[PDB]
Ligand binder design. Sequence first.
Ligand SMILES: *[C@@H]1O[C@H](CO)[C@@H](O[C@@H]2O[C@H](CO)[C@@H](O)[C@H](O)[C@H]2NC(C)=O)[C@H](O)[C@H]1NC(C)=O
Ligand SMILES: *[C@@H]1O[C@H](CO)[C@@H](O[C@@H]2O[C@H](CO)[C@@H](O)[C@H](O)[C@H]2NC(C)=O)[C@H](O)[C@H]1NC(C)=O
Ligand SMILES: *[C@@H]1O[C@H](CO)[C@@H](O[C@@H]2O[C@H](CO)[C@@H](O)[C@H](O)[C@H]2NC(C)=O)[C@H](O)[C@H]1NC(C)=O
Ligand SMILES: *[C@@H]1O[C@H](CO)[C@@H](O[C@@H]2O[C@H](CO)[C@@H](O)[C@H](O)[C@H]2NC(C)=O)[C@H](O)[C@H]1NC(C)=O
Ligand SMILES: *[C@@H]1O[C@H](CO)[C@@H](O[C@@H]2O[C@H](CO)[C@@H](O)[C@H](O)[C@H]2NC(C)=O)[C@H](O)[C@H]1NC(C)=O
Ligand SMILES: *[C@@H]1O[C@H](CO)[C@@H](O)[C@H](O)[C@H]1NC(C)=O
Ligand SMILES: *[C@@H]1O[C@H](CO)[C@@H](O)[C@H](O)[C@H]1NC(C)=O
Ligand SMILES: *[C@@H]1O[C@H](CO)[C@@H](O)[C@H](O)[C@H]1NC(C)=O
Ligand SMILES: *[C@@H]1O[C@H](CO)[C@@H](O)[C@H](O)[C@H]1NC(C)=O
Ligand SMILES: *[C@@H]1O[C@H](CO)[C@@H](O)[C@H](O)[C@H]1NC(C)=O
Lengths: 324, 324, 324, 324, 324
Amino acid sequence: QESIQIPNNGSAPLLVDVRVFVSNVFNVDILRYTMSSMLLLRLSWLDTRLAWNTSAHPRHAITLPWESLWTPRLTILEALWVDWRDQSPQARVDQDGHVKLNLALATETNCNFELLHFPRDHSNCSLSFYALSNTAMELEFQAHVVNEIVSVKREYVVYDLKTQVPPQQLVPCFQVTLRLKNTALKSIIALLVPAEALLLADVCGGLLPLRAIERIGYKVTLLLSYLVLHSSLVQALPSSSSCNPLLIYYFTILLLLLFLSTIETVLLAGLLARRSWPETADRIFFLVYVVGVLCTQFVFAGIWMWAACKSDAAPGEAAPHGRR
Amino acid sequence: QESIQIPNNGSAPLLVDVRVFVSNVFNVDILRYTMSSMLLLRLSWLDTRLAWNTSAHPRHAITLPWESLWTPRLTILEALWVDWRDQSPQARVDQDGHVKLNLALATETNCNFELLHFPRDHSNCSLSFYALSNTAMELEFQAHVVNEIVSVKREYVVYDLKTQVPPQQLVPCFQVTLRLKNTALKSIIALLVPAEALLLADVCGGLLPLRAIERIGYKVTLLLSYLVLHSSLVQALPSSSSCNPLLIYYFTILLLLLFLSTIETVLLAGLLARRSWPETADRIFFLVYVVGVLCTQFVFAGIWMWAACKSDAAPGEAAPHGRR
Amino acid sequence: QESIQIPNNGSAPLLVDVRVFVSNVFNVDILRYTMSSMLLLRLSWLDTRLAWNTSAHPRHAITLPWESLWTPRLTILEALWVDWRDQSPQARVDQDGHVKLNLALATETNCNFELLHFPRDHSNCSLSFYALSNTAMELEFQAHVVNEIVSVKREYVVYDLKTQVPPQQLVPCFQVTLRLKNTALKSIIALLVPAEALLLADVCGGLLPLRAIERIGYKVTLLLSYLVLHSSLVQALPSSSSCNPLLIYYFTILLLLLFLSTIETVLLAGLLARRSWPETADRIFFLVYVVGVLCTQFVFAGIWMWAACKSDAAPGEAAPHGRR
Amino acid sequence: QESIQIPNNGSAPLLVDVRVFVSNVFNVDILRYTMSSMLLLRLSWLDTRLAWNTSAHPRHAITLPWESLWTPRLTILEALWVDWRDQSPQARVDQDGHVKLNLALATETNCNFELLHFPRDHSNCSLSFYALSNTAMELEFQAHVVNEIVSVKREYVVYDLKTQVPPQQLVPCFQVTLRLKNTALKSIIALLVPAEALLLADVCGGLLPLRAIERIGYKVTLLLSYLVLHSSLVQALPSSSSCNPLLIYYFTILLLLLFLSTIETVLLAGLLARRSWPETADRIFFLVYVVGVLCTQFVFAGIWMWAACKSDAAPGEAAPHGRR
Amino acid sequence: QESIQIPNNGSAPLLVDVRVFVSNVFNVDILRYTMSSMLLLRLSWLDTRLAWNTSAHPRHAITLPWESLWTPRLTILEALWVDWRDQSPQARVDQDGHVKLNLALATETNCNFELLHFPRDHSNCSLSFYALSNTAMELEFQAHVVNEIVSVKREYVVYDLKTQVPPQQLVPCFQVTLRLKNTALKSIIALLVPAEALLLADVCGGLLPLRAIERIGYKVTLLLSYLVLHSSLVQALPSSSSCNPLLIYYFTILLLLLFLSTIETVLLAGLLARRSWPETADRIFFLVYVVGVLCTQFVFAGIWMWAACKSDAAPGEAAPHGRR
Ligand SMILES: *[C@@H]1O[C@H](CO)[C@@H](O[C@@H]2O[C@H](CO)[C@@H](O)[C@H](O)[C@H]2NC(C)=O)[C@H](O)[C@H]1NC(C)=O
Ligand SMILES: *[C@@H]1O[C@H](CO)[C@@H](O[C@@H]2O[C@H](CO)[C@@H](O)[C@H](O)[C@H]2NC(C)=O)[C@H](O)[C@H]1NC(C)=O
Ligand SMILES: *[C@@H]1O[C@H](CO)[C@@H](O[C@@H]2O[C@H](CO)[C@@H](O)[C@H](O)[C@H]2NC(C)=O)[C@H](O)[C@H]1NC(C)=O
Ligand SMILES: *[C@@H]1O[C@H](CO)[C@@H](O[C@@H]2O[C@H](CO)[C@@H](O)[C@H](O)[C@H]2NC(C)=O)[C@H](O)[C@H]1NC(C)=O
Ligand SMILES: *[C@@H]1O[C@H](CO)[C@@H](O[C@@H]2O[C@H](CO)[C@@H](O)[C@H](O)[C@H]2NC(C)=O)[C@H](O)[C@H]1NC(C)=O
Ligand SMILES: *[C@@H]1O[C@H](CO)[C@@H](O)[C@H](O)[C@H]1NC(C)=O
Ligand SMILES: *[C@@H]1O[C@H](CO)[C@@H](O)[C@H](O)[C@H]1NC(C)=O
Ligand SMILES: *[C@@H]1O[C@H](CO)[C@@H](O)[C@H](O)[C@H]1NC(C)=O
Ligand SMILES: *[C@@H]1O[C@H](CO)[C@@H](O)[C@H](O)[C@H]1NC(C)=O
Ligand SMILES: *[C@@H]1O[C@H](CO)[C@@H](O)[C@H](O)[C@H]1NC(C)=O
């Protein structure tokens, strides 16, 4: 049973060199705050107990089953689910005792997206592999990442990849940090351009005379269209506890502006039906409304240019598992 | 085969210290009344039969497979499904016989959400781990919970976590109770603000003269928009047997008010077309309608401020499994 | 290999006492005609071959792996999928030879819902456990059910639970029958109240004069709203081969009535535009339409009060597997 | 290791009698072209090597694990996924050597639906079980099917079931062919009746005078309603490479007719606004439109009565695996 | 343990002949950029260590379990998930030592669809099988593909299949490349024909006089219908980082044209209400709008005829795993 035990690197902990190949990052669900990825881990260590003389055995390398020798058991804390593409992996041992193990796994990890600037947002996704059954005094990790992503035409593009071994760790672990950027024009074309078009159409329709019956129906139809579009947008966007996307606030402000315009039009048309004062009031309101729309657009642009979130470090992030 | 048997702590039952780290609570489906979480259980006990002399073996700790020694089999009653992130877990045994076992599991448990005050509701979710194959006379649990949640910007935020071992239990068990609060602005912005805006727009449109043809079409378009919004809300909200959310009742009342306003407008316009009496009736109805809308808003606010549900304890909750 | 063999209860078949605890019934999908449940089965039998003298071994109870002794293999015929929450269950054997086995399983079984009276329908769901590898001459089942349901605020409520062992069976089996009732107000509030409101609004709008241009647009907008609502309802309701819900027929009749009203209004307005005869015809049609709506409501209420379906027993239900 | 080897039936191949019980056919997804079913396979063969004298052993039947004796490994080619409801099945061996094995499996196989006459279409679904590891010179299959379907009130009803062993096969296989018919009224009530109602409403609205302003808005609202309904239908129906359903073509033709009517109405109203000639043209177009609608309905009925598809045999269907 | 080791083909690497039968390609999700397929791999090699004399054993072929002999472990890099339809496959060994292994697997691989010309696009999907545990100096692959697809009436049709073993590989691998073409008329009929119909209807409605009140409402209703259709299309189409489909750009241009037409109509009607100059401006704008619509259609047709994407090779595609 001594074979299952971790090899002893004298006083120093055993060093395991891990190479991570990120094959693909396919599902990035902002609503579920999860990112799905595919990884290949090549773990290399030295096990002098498995070394054999070349005279007795002429093979320069042998293959052993997963449970026939010590292999680190990696667990991902942020991963909702992990699917290992080999239920019975085989480790490879050289004549000098070097052991190499290849593991292909598809995971759905947790990513804290910074959706403040949706749909142009940069997020950091961390995949932390822990050797829970071992301690840092026995196991040490040396992690490298290779960018082997096979899909590039997706909405979210991975542009920065790094690996790091956090210090002051009791449980040996290594984390791969990747940076995700959104380059999808679907949201903009689908919702932002039609929303601005509807807002400009309402502003233009403000020039219709108060006594025109067609003014009311046109405004109400625009309001209904914007209500449908706003419902679609908010259903298509997640809600954060602290920093919701500025897009939903901007759309809510525009919806309130459209409601205010429609309500003013209806109220003044009713008062007129009951140059008179309501017509002058309507003209003044139209000017104030145009000025307010321009001011709102400028204010939203300024907020987008200069925005930040302190947010709050999660208890897992503030106090990582197996520290100190 | 004696190794598989549970260790004997003399007359007293064996004590197992369980530490639970809640890594994340990601899916909280109100429609399915289920909450999905990720947990790490560290179970520590003492097995003097596994102790070895340090002279014979110089290793201070060894690793054994899952089935090579006694390990408690934990089962979650409320969990729809449990996925263990290690099909072949390894227990760690010290030279003194202390055994530590780490198990990472993603579960989808059942939570009875108190959706009366949606979208601002506080719910209690209980995850009960039972050792069905054992009895309380042989196994005893000591549970502690560590808040290591890695996601904080989700709609539902866990703010209170506790562990408790219910008394008078035949089957040894321990339950982790967490408190879930909803901090999502998606529902409010998506549906409550547009609903109030539509209600105020209808109230304002009540001032349109009865003889105005544009009055009818405007009211009907508002009614159609509110019908779409109400259908979306009710489809997006679950139905409870006893205490449905007050939001659906409030929206139904508002929809009935809009239908009443539209029906009155159409009826009086038709009667007038066939200061006359219909105009006076329309003015009186408009005043009564405004007063009724204000009264309804105040009544709903008062109900929200002072509401409660006796509800009913479920048979599983009233009579937990393995009691007495 | 004799341990794996079923114990011999002399000439009579071996008796296995099964206790079923229904922890929860969470998914009840009318569209898929499936019901998802969670069960705990405690199977107790007597195996004198496993009895041991208390002098040789002081343990009063031992635990054995799943494959180390004979354990009945239960299969559910109606279950779309079964997930056992313990891949390596352990049986418990007393010193007298009594064996107790606990199995927690989440299943998605097939339920033939009687959706004639949707959304107030009572259905019977049967979960049949068969020991396919055994015969009735060797294995006998004694089943009891304990109501330990942990969720009570769901749309569907289980109110009656029973267990029965069908007679004249070749393959030993036992079935748990539960009664499901629908107490969800979501469907009613979402679709029935708005449909009746739209119907009453159309009836009231029938009083608009034929020469009023606003009459046509109002009717068409109501027709469009009812078309959307009807499409939503029919998409949200399953279709049965024999007895479709009366709700879809009632909504189809109401939709046809609305189409007839709109078509009559348009036809008579066109004829008038080309007390004149069209106005008298419109008044007579309005009276006939109101009478017909009242008669249709009364007829639907009477049908709901007195309705039944002979339906047809399925081949599996008429001829259960392993009978005679 | 000779026990694992297939028994030798002299020169002739070993004969395995397979009885298939179709418990249920639950998911029939036309969009995915897949059919989900549940089957119980009872495989009986003769293994004289397992026969034992009744004097040495008094048991008339024994149970053996899945891997302790030769059992054919059945694979389904058309099955997207197969879930075996017993990870460790047990075979039953009599004293004479007869071996019976029961396997319960839920599969999602591929069915080539003939959706030309949707929603009244008849399709053939074939489930082919192959013994890939064996050859026809060693293994022979004798398949029978028993109709034990437990669900009868679903949209799709299985009415014909057969089993056949294709000739000139190298890999021994047997296929179960079932006939699926659609008896769902959901599609008709949801979409066909409203579409015909909208078409008749548009035809009736054609009688509105050209100078009536209400004519244009009514036509456009009907056009919008039909656009929504058409989008819903096409989204709810799959697209075939060769024979798309005639329903989508019929709805496209009706949509084009509605667009033509609306465009003609708008064009002639504009020309008139700029008995005059446009009124005569509108009357002639209305007559031609009514005649064309009737002719289109008759032509569609005739096409439905007399329609066929040569289609094309798939490479798998034309050249089945393991033939010749 | 020497049996598990890879056979030695002298100095040259061992040659494994792989035959791939593509049973079906069922799910082609453009939104997820994934393609789901079903494959049967027949791997044949020579293992002289397993050869036996025909005199000692009369069997001409034997079956061995998966782990009783060396079998290459194939891993798919692009596959999101792989489901092997046989958890315990059996290899077949002849008397001469030839070993044949049949593996049926359903995979969901990653395909980089060239969605520029949606819905008529040709894509290349590559399924790469790697023997990670082995090196090219020991293992060599010879791959052949057989077109045994059983489904032909799906939206996406596979018309070209090839296999290739990339040169200069360290890890032995072979990739199957298939060509996917879209033959679905669902998208065209659902969205392109209605969009062109709406555009032509708006062009025709441009002839309505500026003083006609019905002109504004008709234009706004067409705009709302096109907004709904555009939202449906963009929701139904994925967004690419580099080359989004030209269809979304064309629909955005048409939506902008409709917004411009509606805004111009409203502005000029308002100015006129406040042959006059606005009428002449409206006529000139109508002519310019018709010319612009024709020019836009011609430009889009020309772009469709002559379009290309340089795009960018993904890091995995540019530098395949296990090269050099
Ligand atoms: C045993 O421990 C020593 C020290 O920790 C390891 O030597 C280090 O190896 C890394 C290679 O990545 C070097 O960067 C360090 O500079 C080395 N440090 C020293 C003091 O030599 C050694 O690799 C370990 N051996 C095994 C088999 O784990
Ligand atoms: C054996 O039983 C005794 C008594 O139940 C256990 O002693 C208790 O340990 C806990 C530590 O959490 C203390 O809080 C109690 O005060 C102790 N009670 C007594 C009477 O000492 C003991 O831990 C058990 N030992 C094992 C290996 O299970
Ligand atoms: C062996 O067979 C006998 C008879 O079938 C069983 O005795 C029955 O046990 C049940 C308890 O549920 C009683 O209700 C019956 O009245 C008993 N019948 C008789 C004739 O005694 C006995 O339980 C079986 N023993 C085992 C180990 O299976
Ligand atoms: C061995 O081979 C013979 C011939 O193939 C089998 O005998 C046949 O059994 C079937 C029963 O379904 C009959 O319909 C045939 O008429 C029989 N043919 C002959 C020539 O007898 C026999 O069943 C096989 N035995 C085993 C154990 O597989
Ligand atoms: C051992 O290596 C030799 C050479 O690589 C293999 O011989 C080749 O087999 C293929 C058959 O597909 C031929 O196309 C080549 O022309 C052969 N080359 C030579 C030099 O003979 C041989 O197949 C390998 N044997 C085994 C068991 O792997
Ligand atoms: C993401 O990582 C980069 C450094 O790699 C850091 O500068 C940045 O602040 C991080 N952003 C967030 C939201 O954590
Ligand atoms: C939830 O738990 C707290 C105490 O932890 C208790 O006060 C409260 O009543 C509980 N609420 C419900 C709905 O059970
Ligand atoms: C359901 O079961 C009860 C008895 O338990 C029976 O009276 C009733 O007829 C059954 N209903 C159906 C639809 O089978
Ligand atoms: C289906 O099977 C029947 C015979 O069982 C055959 O007559 C019919 O042509 C088949 N239809 C198709 C589409 O294959
Ligand atoms: C796809 O493969 C063919 C050759 O098989 C090649 O000509 C074509 O350029 C490839 N297309 C893409 C987008 O890679």
